[model samples]
Target: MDFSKMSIVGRIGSEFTEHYLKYSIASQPRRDGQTNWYNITVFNEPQINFLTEYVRKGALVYVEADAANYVFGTTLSLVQKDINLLKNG
Candidate 1:
């Protein structure tokens, strides 16, 4: 079996960073005036560099990623497969 892929469009809420694993935070607003935070995990080096230069806070992004089961194996997380910059802010 393999992890299924998914896509999410949201705004960057934090800087792209790396310590042991590279990652960033993205947020999406919902009805009732609130938002949800997504843990965007980046795998591989070139994409890391690409994100560092462009994916800043408040930037709109379309992310294609590998989806994981929620409430299992730590927390619900997404592994970045591709990134598309829709708008920069």
Candidate 2:
């Protein structure tokens, strides 16, 4: 991993239902593997645009940030997850 230039701080926005401009994979599957609906609230509209435009469906995203969320990227460090918990929590 490129810790030299990576931000560990990112806000997780709400997971709202959004339509795909183009038909793609289903976020869920059969009874065994249903798509997990989640809301990832981001601070900026541009990040949302990026996800809406390219990430497509059935992707994976893990985030940590304030509940209200923010647009600008958060300052990050290679310290530890505990820092993230404190900063965002």
Candidate 3:
């Protein structure tokens, strides 16, 4: 089945994790005093490099991605298609 395209504006939760051909970022959507985290995986080289250089902990970002929810828990995975750095941390 195909995943849905989703968008979110949130703050980076931690430093990026680099992997083969991809990078992973943790993001948190803050609502009230509660924050929910999502793992965003960047696959494209351009975006990866951009994230590596410009993004850091607590950076505000706008992300467009393909979303998938795991059946076992409330784990959400986002495969990044595009990203905008709104504010640096």
Candidate 4:
């Protein structure tokens, strides 16, 4: 199987929101005054449980995922593959 991958290292800007089995990581503002946002969906049960317990706002994180653009080509959606907590908020 082939997939486009994306990696992001940034701070979490909003609280985690759930959509059934999926979860979202909200908008993160960059140092250049631009904002980058992502909807991170975790399909793995164990990973989802871990994220629910650990991921939080203002936390610095490194995310690796399968990348895809939104329908209108304005935003990004990610199928989270791996994540690492860099620092606590």
Better of 3 and 4 by lDDT: 3
What tens-digit string does per-residue lDDT give for candidate 1 at 26-83? 5546656667678887876678887887566788888898887776355776888888
Query: Where does candidate 4 clash, by residue pair?
Result: none
Give the poorly placed runs of model 1, Cα more than 4 Å off.
Answer: 1-3, 20-25, 29-31, 70-74
Error of 3 at 44 (Å): 0.5
Cα displacement (Å) at residue 4, model 3: 0.8
Question: Per-residue CA lDDT of candidate 4, range 17-65, in tens?
Answer: 6662454444455556766766677777777777778766778888898
C-alpha lDDT of all candidate models, in order: 0.74, 0.33, 0.75, 0.72
Q: Which ranges in model 3 have alpha carbons more than 4 Å from their true place?
A: 1-3, 20-31, 70-75
Q: Score candidate 4 by TM-score against the native.
A: 0.73
Candidate 3 TM-score, true structure as reference: 0.75
Query: Per-residue alpha-carbon lDDT of model 2 for 1-89, expressed as tens digits?
Result: 32232223232233324442111212243558745433333434555455555443334433332323235775322211111222221
RMSD of each: 2.7, 13.7, 3.1, 3.0
Worst 10 residues of 3 by lDDT: 20-29
For residue 15, model 1's alpha carbon misses the true position, in angstroms, by 1.4
TM-score of 1: 0.76
lDDT of 3: 0.75
The best candidate in terms of TM-score = 1
